[model samples]
Target: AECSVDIQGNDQMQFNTNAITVDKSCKQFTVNLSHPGNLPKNVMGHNFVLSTAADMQGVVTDGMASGLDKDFLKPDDSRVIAQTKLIGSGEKDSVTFDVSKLKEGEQFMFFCTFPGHSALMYGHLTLK
Candidate 1:
């Protein structure tokens, strides 16, 4: 069976849940994101960025140049395994990636790349 999850970001710069598990039996995994707060994308936007903990910094740093229109991510950044588009005020986005991208003992991470959101909104993703 495939693995899928639903997560949300709020005006408080928070994700509703943290930590995810991807079963090795799965061929692909999907993550859906939503923003329920009444804030605009420029102010309280959020997105689900997936990458290795090591690549996390590169994703954030490179993303800064793309601005929010590109979902605050560098255009086709090879390091990003998967990502949801930026969302705000009841918006939503989702992305699906191959499960083979994950490996046992690797440290994967997901967070909102909305400038400082990473400091407060990052979480772990484990492959099982």
Candidate 2:
């Protein structure tokens, strides 16, 4: 099975997919995020942040105050399981993490921490 996945964020404030399942065959996993719209980071930035479902809102709240300079993520936030850099149109970032960090049946989520983006740019991530 594949150990990497890709997701897209655009000016529309949307992630192309709503769910991702990490294959049991993977020991490490990679998530590649891309910005595919015509907007700048200051305007329509996007990034991929992963955490437990319960911590999602808290992460996004703190991240909103962190600003784009920090990729809209709180610096050294322990709640983040993995994340990519904030990116604008034509830019891409990827994050790789040890598969062992995930537990089967745990409720994890992945979302963009950009201000107001999480409303439409979040998704469920599962490990199998």
Candidate 3:
């Protein structure tokens, strides 16, 4: 919980956990990702995308056209709190973020910004 954790994204278009509470004692956090499904990145690709819950919609909106090469994210998107690279089945990736991106009562959310994936693969993240 303090150093690292893996998030699973499978063929079901779901994530294993939808919530996380950070321990403020840590200055940085690491997140791992895995796709166990047999699909390719173009079909059921997944990635971890984070932002203020209020900003999530806009982020997702702008990302729709960015395509897979950009990780389905806008270029230099200031709204993103943190994000990981897109991955396909049998593949994995990780991202390390500065703990300062979080604030109490901020209501942050993280999801797969792969176009329509957010509707089925989003999660809430909290920091104190």
Top candidate by TM-score: 2
Winner by lDDT between candidate 2 and candidate 1:
2
| lDDT (Cα atoms) of all candidates against the true structure | 0.88, 0.91, 0.87
Give one digit per residue, the lDDT tens place, for model 2 in 1-128.
29989899999999999999998888899999898999999999999999999999999999999887888899999999999999999999989999887866679999999999999999999987
Q: Each model's TM-score, in the order given?
A: 0.93, 0.96, 0.94
Q: How many residue pairs clash in each candidate at the backbone level?
A: 0, 0, 0
Write one digit per residue (lDDT tens) for candidate 1, span 1-128: 25898888999999998888888778899998889899989999999999999999989977877888787899978889889888888899989999878856679999888888898889999888
Model 3 Cα shift for residue 110 (angstroms): 0.6
Greater TM-score among 1 and 2 belongs to 2
Q: List the residue pairs that clash in candidate 2.
A: none
lDDT of 2 at 112: 91
Off by over 4 Å in 2: none
User: Which lDDT tens digits does candidate 3 get at residues 1-128?
Assistant: 66567899899899888986677787898889999999988999999888999999998888888988998999999999888889999999999998887866688998998879999898888775
